[PDB]
Amino acid sequence: MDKNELVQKAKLAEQAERYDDMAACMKSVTEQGAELSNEERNLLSVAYKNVVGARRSSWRVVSSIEQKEKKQQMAREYREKIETELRDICNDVLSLLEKFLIPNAAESKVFYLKMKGDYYRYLAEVAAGDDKKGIVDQSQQAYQEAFEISKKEMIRLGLALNFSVFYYACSLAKTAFDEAIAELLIMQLLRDNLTLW
């Protein structure tokens, strides 16, 4: 396939901004013989996040507008479409993780398992019925799994942020952020998130 050409292809794509292209080359690379060289590993997260997050954004706004009837049938209609593009990415990557990444790793374990909880979390926001539950739980047992592989050889602090804000707590953000002070964007971020909650 030429893994290192798919890699040097995604890079080009990122420099050219086309993220759906980048996430594509990086998915091809990931489903080869894994172990994603540090550049590749980030390239994966950077491409997929530019993609997913975009829909996460669209979905946010079109939903704000769906709430504030027919202008809502037409808004539910669109939101249903932007939720699909979204679900398709989270599934696309979720598989990559559980199926090739998380089971092929030390630090990278919590980097990935954080990402598993992350995308599942995006699926939870967007979920529906009991579906909602089965998913939001899966977000926890992944975040909490990376969390447990934190007090180890330590991404870690970054997890705190996500996982903490997954609960919505502020408590957990201090703790993380408190153990970070005795180590003396990431640090201020959850300090900042405490101004909120």
Added chain:
Amino acid sequence: MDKNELVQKAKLAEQAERYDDMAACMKSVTEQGAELSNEERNLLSVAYKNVVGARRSSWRVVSSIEQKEKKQQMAREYREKIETELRDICNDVLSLLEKFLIPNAAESKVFYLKMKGDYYRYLAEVAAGDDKKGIVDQSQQAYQEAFEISKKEMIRLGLALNFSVFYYACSLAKTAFDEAIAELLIMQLLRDNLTLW
């Protein structure tokens, strides 16, 4: 088809940033029975402009990257693609233009004819052999048509700007602005462009 629902749809799309969704919605409105109400007329040019605009940016970076060999086929190959994606937009807007828009026009006549010149100018940047010439002149005589209505019920000054970059001139861009300073963003823009040439 519900022209106004297609219209309400593109105001939504753009608000959600999905510009391809916008151009799509606005293209439908324009290929109805025209005389695109002013709100529609810019909405159309804001959608299509972010779209082809995106491609021109990508084309610029990828083309530069492509010059600085196998990594070059890899990039000539990628450029090849962005170009195809970009030629389908110009062809796409040029038809609305010449076959629905420009013939169903006061001041709009210059706005549109300018747009014709623009999108032909884009194909001129991207074209290759003897194709290049046919395109660049087709752009000239469109710019040149709108250019002569410049001197009518007058966009016109913004036309001067574009039409001036079309020659690369520094002449017309002074002239455009000379007279603009006997009328006392756009105005600084062509002055500023004289600080480059």
